[PDB]
């Protein structure tokens, strides 16, 4: 069986084909980052326009890449939410109508379930149950996962998500948007320990997060200190180490609370190299296992959508002829 | 030939099929419902006419201008359909479609189309039908402030009919123009009226592959401000 997957939730157009015998047969990705960088944020109208420019051509490239033709596709899955309405609509209209013309099932996919399941795309995927740390641009959640569509929320951010926190602090350090990855690279240049940021909400028990106070601390530190390259590297490092310790501490507590032996990380922040290393080290001391996708499947991509599409198809989640999108769509509300 | 037309650029959703000498069409107001109605309409038309998507010679789509979201719905759906069944595509102006509507409803041959574009503008065109039924005036399409429309109308002459939601929002639009204006009786484009235009285009080879189908937004200044310095 093979599923075409379509991802247009924000500012990446992603198309992939996933075959359950042979694996990933195609993965096409266009990122709009240069279009939005000039603005310091994603401009929805422009994002929507550029999805139109890219979706159909990247579908054609996917089929050619894989050497398949229409008849070899069993279903078409597309991100229905959460995300920007305008963007989501482009991939959903193309996908649902393509499915109609090919006369195959159309599978609407929850963008964060895509992220959650991206580790399943690697060798040695996690078995249920596990704790999932979803850590993206606008999400930061701890989830107890007992099976497909059995997601119990355990902790979440009450303000900024970890990704936003990275991007917001990167902007203060003069980097282009989104600056999280660049902040991470600068950080490798930093003197460990020269500055020390709080680990918010780590002094009382509990699983929720807050990161807003961390920007504040960054900005004050950028104010009371020199603007040379090193001093900025050192601030980037301190910011990064603190976020990573916070995520780690909280993952520990959820592993404690659940008694689970498996930690799965996903979302764009799970590309962060320090984070990956620290959670792997932690799971080794606990004698459990950590899981994550390759770095390019942590951030938005089509592969995860084709995979999650396949899973939802097999779970019976097929759409009628209507097309709908859900810009806000809590993960806990998905059925099992 | 068989030609399937789809439109969602405005408050209306419509689908229509030119089926070798008869038309089978649907039209309704779908505010908030375009994406729930559009494929069921397509399905119903194909089934009731006993045609399938791969019997179609071309897919005509409402290219714009109009609702940015609407226009994208239209071309999204039209693109998956065309990609899926390997159909060539024919983009049709929503302004020109309303002109054709007026010709259909009351024999109008010179049309001033104005769509309410919001932000105190309208999408504008001057369409005139020759003795062969071809609509001239595509070069006049534009997004304009009413006072600029007014200036433009003073450079025109003769009798015109008015179509589109632009005239409802701004009913004094032709004040002191010097033209005789009559009500064209068309507020919205209908897929049914894209058909004669698309059939003509098909006969002449004015089609494009799905990867070259584009919306016409007319308003392209749509960002907020850039950061200091770029
Ligand atoms: N190596 C990294 N370190 C920290 N943050 C990263 C890294 N790579 C990507 N990010 C952040 O991940 C976020 C993008 O997450 P992603 O899941 O791709 O998008 P979305 O939030 O749109 O689902 C951005 O906040 C980005 O800055
Ligand atoms: N979130 C959505 N989901 C499905 N369809 C939508 C959505 N948003 C807009 N549309 C469709 O596009 C049409 C145009 O949207 P818009 O230009 O914002 O005008 P309005 O909201 O005033 O109707 C809507 O009437 C609706 O049918
Ligand atoms: Mg993105």
Numbering used by the authors:
A (entry chain A): 1 to 336
B (entry chain C): 1 to 230
Original authors' sentences:
The N6-threonylcarbamoyladenosine (t6A) modification at position 37 of ANN-decoding tRNAs is one of the few modifications that are found in the three domains of life. In archaea and yeast, the transfer reaction requires the kinase, putative endopeptidase and other proteins of small size (KEOPS) protein complex, composed of Kae1, Bud32, Cgi121 and Pcc1, complemented by a fifth fungi-specific protein Gon7 in yeast. It is now well established that YgjD and its orthologs Kae1 and Qri7 are responsible for the catalysis of the transfer reaction.
We cocrystallized the YgjD–YeaZ heterodimer with ATP and MgCl2 and determined the structure at a resolution of 2.3 Å. As expected we observed clear electron density for a nucleotide bound to two metal ions in the active site of YgjD, which we interpreted as Mg2+ and Fe2+/3+ based on electron density levels and X-ray fluorescence scanning at the Fe-edge (data not shown). We did not observe electron density for the γ-phosphate group of ATP, which probably has been converted into ADP during the crystallization process. An ADP molecule could unequivocally fit the density and its refined B-factors were similar to those of the surrounding side chains. The β-phosphate is forming an ionic interaction with YeaZArg118 and the ribose 2′- and 3′-OH groups are forming hydrogen bonds with the YeaZHis34 side chain and the main chain carbonyl of YeaZArg32, both these residues are also very well conserved. The adenine base lies on top of a hydrophobic depression created at the interacting interface of YgjD–YeaZ (YeaZThr69 and YgjDLeu89) but does not form any specific H-bond interactions with the heterodimer.
